[PDB]
């Protein structure tokens, strides 16, 4: 099993919220639009657990 994939894990030490996402991106990793979306995607996901559930959205 030798595929080209990447695992980006984003966790908040302030909220202690961990979030991992498997994304297979070669050069796209260097890409800002992709990296930004990834970083934001991860964060967006981390916050996703904050909003909707466990308390209603407010701060955000």
If the CB atoms of residues 36 and 57 are measured against its own copies, the closer one turns out to be: 36
- State the minimum distance, in angstroms, from the CB of residue 7 to its own copies: 4
- State the minimum distance, in angstroms, from the CB of residue 54 to its own copies: 18
- State the minimum distance, in angstroms, from the CB of residue 46 to its own copies: 9
Contact of 21 with 29, CB cutoff 8 Å: no
Residues at the site binding its own copies, with contacts judged by CB under 8 A: 2-14, 18, 20, 22, 24, 29-40, 42-43
Unique residue bearing structure tokens 């916050």 = 47
Taking the C-alpha atoms of residue 41 and residue 10, their distance in angstroms, rounded to an integer, is 10
Taking the C-alpha atoms of residue 15 and residue 26, their distance in angstroms, rounded to an integer, is 30
């Amino acid at each position: 099993m030798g595929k080209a994939t990447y695992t980006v894990t984003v966790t908040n030490n302030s909220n202690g919220v961990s979030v991992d996402y498997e994304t297979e991106t070669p050069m796209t990793l260097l890409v800002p639009e992709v990296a930004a979306e990834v970083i934001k995607d991860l964060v967006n996901t981390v916050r996703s657990y904050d909003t909707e559930n466990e308390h209603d959205v407010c701060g955000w």
